[PDB]
From Swiss-Prot:
Sequence ranges assigned to domain PWWP in this UniProt record: 7-64
Annotated protein name in UniProt: Hepatoma-derived growth factor-related protein 2
Quaternary context: Interacts with HDGF. Interacts with trimethylated 'Lys-36' of histone H3 (H3K36me3). Interacts with trimethylated 'Lys-79' of histone H3 (H3K79me3), but has higher affinity for H3K36me3. Interacts with IWS1. Interacts with H2AX, POGZ, RBBP8 and CBX1. Interacts with histones H3K9me3, H3K27me3 and H3K36me2. Interacts with DPF3a (isoform 2 of DPF3/BAF45C). Interacts with SMARCA4/BRG1/BAF190A, SMARCC1/BAF155 and SMARCD1/BAF60A in a DPF3a-dependent manner.
Family to which the UniProt record says this protein belongs: Belongs to the HDGF family.
Compartment list: Nucleus; Cytoplasm
Boundaries of the shown chain within the full protein: 1 to 92 of 671
Function: Acts as an epigenetic regulator of myogenesis in cooperation with DPF3a (isoform 2 of DPF3/BAF45C). Associates with the BAF complex via its interaction with DPF3a and HDGFL2-DPF3a activate myogenic genes by increasing chromatin accessibility through recruitment of SMARCA4/BRG1/BAF190A (ATPase subunit of the BAF complex) to myogenic gene promoters. Promotes the repair of DNA double-strand breaks (DSBs) through the homologous recombination pathway by facilitating the recruitment of the DNA endonuclease RBBP8 to the DSBs.
Superkingdom in the source lineage: Eukaryota
Organism: Homo sapiens (Human)
Tissue: Widely expressed. High expression is found in heart, skeletal muscle, ovary and testis. Overexpression is frequently observed in hepatocellular carcinoma samples.
Length: 92
């Protein structure tokens, strides 16, 4: 059975106006800004932007990569596809 999301989990994350995007649940560094309640810091591969999202917008990477893990014209998407497959836990 599924668990709650945790830092390091790999997802496709959905934001309005954007395709489902390769991302991870980030950790929160000591002294860094915390997200609102029931939100997670989502690091977007390729663009390297962070947003605060709830689970409604988070799709598991392994289960959903066949649907969402295809090249896309948006800037940074294909770099992000490379990152999530080849070094998703690196420092960016």
């Amino acid at each position: 059975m599924p668990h709650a999301f945790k830092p390091g989990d790999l997802v496709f994350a959905k934001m309005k106006g954007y395709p489902h995007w390769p991302a991870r649940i980030d950790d929160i560094a000591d002294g860094a800004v915390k997200p609102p309640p029931n939100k997670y810091p989502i690091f977007f591969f390729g663009t390297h932007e962070t947003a605060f999202l709830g689970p409604k917008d988070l799709f598991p990477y392994d289960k959903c990569k066949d649907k969402y893990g295809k090249p896309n014209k948006r800037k940074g998407f294909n770099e992000g596809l490379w990152e999530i497959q080849n070094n998703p836990h690196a420092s960016y």
